[PDB]
């Protein structure tokens, strides 16, 4: 099946192209923002993995929900999420974001962020030490490596 061979190789090529750079947007409310800045630090690079910190939600590949999400914040967070280009992926960073965390039993704190957006990679820690976030971004890249998108477009 030379057509299936071509579709498999071309899907491998375009999924490599997708997982190559993956420039995020740094949403970053509380101290998890400081830790995102500290994995933007000179010791732990991001440019080695093609990752560039960038304040442009009009072109951002993945979105890193980090910090304590509140009721006064969450419509603005999803309104940022909605003006995002449709191939989109979500990293929930931090105990506050991945299930409520320390301010769980509390008004004006959304219990997690599944109540707002879907989540692809949970990375726990408080703050998740930058090596753990970087391993989470590697597992996100390998999630992009396992997609079989064009194969499903073939055999659909």
């Amino acid at each position: 099946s030379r057509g299936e061979y071509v579709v498999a190789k071309l899907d491998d090529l375009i999924n490599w192209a997708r997982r190559s750079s993956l420039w995020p947007m740094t949403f970053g409310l509380a101290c998890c923002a400081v830790e995102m800045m500290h994995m933007a630090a000179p010791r732990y690079d991001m440019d080695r993995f093609g990752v560039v910190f960038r304040a442009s939600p009009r072109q951002s590949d993945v979105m890193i929900v980090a910090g304590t999400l509140t009721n006064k914040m969450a419509p603005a967070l999803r309104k940022v999420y909605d003006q995002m280009p449709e191939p989109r992926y979500v990293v929930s960073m931090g105990s506050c974001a991945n299930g409520g965390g320390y301010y769980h039993y509390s008004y004006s704190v959304v219990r997690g962020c599944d109540r707002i957006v879907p989540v692809d990679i949970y990375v726990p820690g408080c703050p998740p030490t930058a090596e753990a976030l970087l391993y989470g971004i590697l597992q996100l890249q390998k999630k992009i490596k396992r997609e079989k998108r064009l194969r499903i477009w073939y055999r659909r």
Partner: protein, 176 residues
């Protein structure tokens, strides 16, 4: 005792004012800033090659939430609920039953890794040091179900290694 900045006056000697005007017209200390930045260009970069060179740590890092057990023996925990009492996030959830041996034991021992703020109070509150903040910090969980650990996930997490945790506790059983 104090030391305050910016109390002088620009001089009235012609040499000093023409040096300041030369700085104004001739972009001088801008070029000196370029020289400083090129002096940091020619250093060697202090980046660690991440998946091959992992970062430095401590003997007392607070990580993985792995239980321990006795030397050639059974489970170390008691279900005495001190960790659940001290847990500030209240992520510990314990249900105890005793077994046929007579000694008191458990049934259910759940840690909400979503809620866990990683303090060390359950490490320092266990009178037998059963629950230990583990060594490594590599969780990276796809689903939301998998961040809710059972007693068996904690015991397999503590039987995939103890010699690491035993080495850490044998290193620093004297401070705490």
């Amino acid at each position: 005792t104090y030391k305050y900045v910016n109390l002088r006056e620009p001089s009235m000697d012609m040499k000093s004012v023409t040096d300041r005007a030369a700085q104004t017209l001739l972009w001088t200390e801008l070029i000196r800033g370029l020289g400083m930045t090129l002096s940091y260009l020619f250093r060697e970069p202090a980046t660690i090659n991440y998946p091959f060179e992992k970062g430095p740590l401590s003997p007392r890092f607070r990580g993985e939430h792995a239980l321990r057990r006795y030397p050639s023996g059974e489970e170390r925990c008691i279900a005495c609920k001190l960790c659940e009492a001290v847990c500030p996030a209240q992520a510990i959830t314990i249900e105890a039953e005793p077994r046929a041996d007579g000694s008191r034991r458990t049934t259910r021992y759940d840690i909400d890794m979503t809620k866990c703020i990683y303090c060390g109070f359950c490490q320092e509150a266990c009178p037998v040091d059963a629950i230990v903040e583990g060594p490594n910090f590599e969780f990276s969980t796809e689903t939301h179900e998998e961040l809710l650990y059972n007693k068996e996930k904690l015991l397999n997490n503590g039987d995939k290694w103890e010699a690491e945790i035993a080495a850490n506790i044998q290193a620093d059983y004297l401070y705490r």
